[PDB]
């Protein structure tokens, strides 16, 4: 296929990982310049996990309550709470802080994750933000504070800090503005998730990937317009399709129009009828148009 699950090289982010302890809890933190970010649930004790009252928690804390370690040693000289995260300030500026921003990722967008335990980076994988604002990851006890990010030129865009497992193999976390993806609360009550959905734009990308590899049996002259497909999407668990220049690029290189692949989606969704594509028996929606442009073309 020439399509692999590709994440960014992780060196830049490895040098920012630290361990943070408060009370009984230990987990990972992200050390950027003079601040260390970590999940605020590091504060509460075992038998309040179901309903913490984080504000009262914050008050009971001092700078001495938190211990930060690079596994130098770091002295915390300030603590603040920003939504579901702690913003700790420490007396040493991370000598290898990369150029960075904080940006919240949208459903369908991919990013790289550095899984960490006890401040030790143990591995990377890429994931797509689900239409239901969860992520299908690989996170175990000890995982929280692990970090997700994209990269643009030299700038690392931090978009995710791991927080919790909502149900078997299904995860969520906060953006660095402290908000949780989407609206989930950091307490151990049962919480209902919205129904996940196929990411239309990504499935389209994947089909263009197939065409570029000479697998084009599913292409017909028939078309479905963007507007009719979106009305169909609503009733069939697909996200609304929104075109981008990177998709447009794929359409131009292959000569196959977006709306021919919209039609093909409608048909393939009902069944592959014995055949394979690249070579699966179901639609793939975890590759973005930019993945396809990058891994297969230029670009």
């Amino acid at each position: 296929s020439g399509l692999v699950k590709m994440s960014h090289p992780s060196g830049d982010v490895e040098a920012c990982m630290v361990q943070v302890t408060c009370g009984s809890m230990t987990l990972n933190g992200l050390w950027l310049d003079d601040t260390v970010w970590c999940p605020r649930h590091v504060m509460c004790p075992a038998d309040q996990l179901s309903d913490p009252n984080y504000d009262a928690l914050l008050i009971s804390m001092t700078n001495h309550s938190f211990s930060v370690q690079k596994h130098a040693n770091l002295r915390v000289v300030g603590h603040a709470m920003q939504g579901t995260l702690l913003k700790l300030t420490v007396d040493v500026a991370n000598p290898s802080t990369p150029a960075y921003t904080f940006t919240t990722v949208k459903p369908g967008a991919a990013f790289s994750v550095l899984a960490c335990y006890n401040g030790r980076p143990t591995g990377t994988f890429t994931v797509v933000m689900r239409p239901n604002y969860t992520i299908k990851g690989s996170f175990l006890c000890g995982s929280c504070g692990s970090v997700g990010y994209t990269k643009e030129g030299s700038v690392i865009n931090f978009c995710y800090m791991h927080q919790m497992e909502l149900a078997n193999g299904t995860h969520t976390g906060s953006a660095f503005d402290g908000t949780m993806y989407g609206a989930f609360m950091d307490k151990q009550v049962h919480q209902v998730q919205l129904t996940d959905k196929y990411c239309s734009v990504n499935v389209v990308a994947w089909l263009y990937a197939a065409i570029l590899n000479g697998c084009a049996w599913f292409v017909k002259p028939n078309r479905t317009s963007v507007v009719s497909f979106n009305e169909w999407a609503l009733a069939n668990q697909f996200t609304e399709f929104v075109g981008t220049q990177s998709v447009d690029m794929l359409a131009v290189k292959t000569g196959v129009a977006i709306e021919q692949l919209l039609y093909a989606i409608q048909q393939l969704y009902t069944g592959f009828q014995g055949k394979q594509i690249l070579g699966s028996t179901m639609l793939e929606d975890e590759f973005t148009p930019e993945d396809v442009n990058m891994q297969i073309m230029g670009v």
Partner: peptide, 5 residues
């Protein structure tokens, strides 16, 4: 069910 990690 929601499990803090």
């Amino acid at each position: 069910x929601a499990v803090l990690x």
